[PDB]
Design a protein around this ligand. Structure first.
Ligand code: HEM
Ligand code: HEM
Ligand code: HEM
Ligand code: HEM
Length: 107
């Protein structure tokens, strides 16, 4: 079984890099993020070629990297989509977990 990596992982495909900590995400099944592809949970980097490798932030296809991290209504919850549900009606948590600036994702 693949093991979770160390905390402090940088996601740095873009000029707005974000740190991923697995320890804060333990309530989440591995395969909700490392989702099935062709019937098997895929643990490759999300922007691997053929995966979310389209760096146009307007793209909404299954290759759009921005889309996979930010949008609602996706087949697997995105960073922002899950965080919106987590924050609920709490505006402080909305700023912390979903704010586009001054949040725990983006300074
Ligand atoms: C669950 C315990 C779980 C495992 C196992 C796991 C593994 C894992 C690996 C091996 C990597 C490194 C991939 C590489 O080769 O660099 C990795 C990286 C990321 N993970 Fe993960 N992970 C588990 C759980 C979760 C959960 C619950 C999420 C989503 C909340 C998540 C997400 C990520 C992300 C993002 C990365 C970085 C990938 C990238 O930048 O391309 N993981 N994980
Ligand atoms: C890396 C941890 C990673 C993330 C994050 C992630 C996100 C993601 C979302 C949010 C979707 C749904 C998008 C929607 O509009 O419905 C989604 C969908 C697919 N992905 Fe992905 N994904 C990550 C990793 C990987 C990897 C490593 C690949 C390539 C092997 C990949 C591929 C795909 C494909 C294909 C889809 C569509 C799947 C389907 O329709 O069943 N993803 N991902
Ligand atoms: C997507 C790759 C993604 C990112 C990036 C991300 C970031 C993130 C941060 C920065 C925090 C704060 C704690 C920390 O610094 O590690 C945080 C917290 C929570 N997250 Fe998250 N998150 C990503 C994805 C997801 C997904 C897909 C879910 C749900 C399915 C999810 C959940 C949560 C939860 C719960 C927390 C804790 C909330 C807090 O304690 O108030 N995240 N994440
Ligand atoms: C708020 C809705 C919000 C906005 C707007 C936003 C923007 C943004 C940009 C412009 C990028 C770079 C895109 C590019 O290719 O140039 C970027 C990248 C990432 N973001 Fe973001 N972002 C908003 C909010 C959040 C929140 C709250 C999180 C975390 C839950 C988050 C996550 C991510 C991730 C992951 C990336 C990619 C990091 C990288 O690989 O460089 N965003 N965002």
């Amino acid at each position: 079984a693949p093991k979770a990596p160390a905390d402090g992982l940088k996601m740095d495909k873009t000029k707005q890099p974000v740190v991923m900590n697995h320890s804060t995400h333990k309530a989440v099944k591995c395969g909700d993020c490392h989702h099935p592809v062709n019937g098997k949970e895929d643990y490759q980097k999300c922007a691997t070629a053929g995966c979310h490798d389209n760096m146009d932030k307007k793209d909404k296809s299954a290759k759009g990297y921005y889309h996979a991290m930010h949008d609602k209504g996706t087949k697997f919850k995105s960073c922002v989509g899950c965080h919106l549900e987590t924050a609920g009606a709490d505006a402080a948590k909305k700023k912390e977990l979903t704010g586009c600036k001054g949040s725990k994702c983006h300074s």
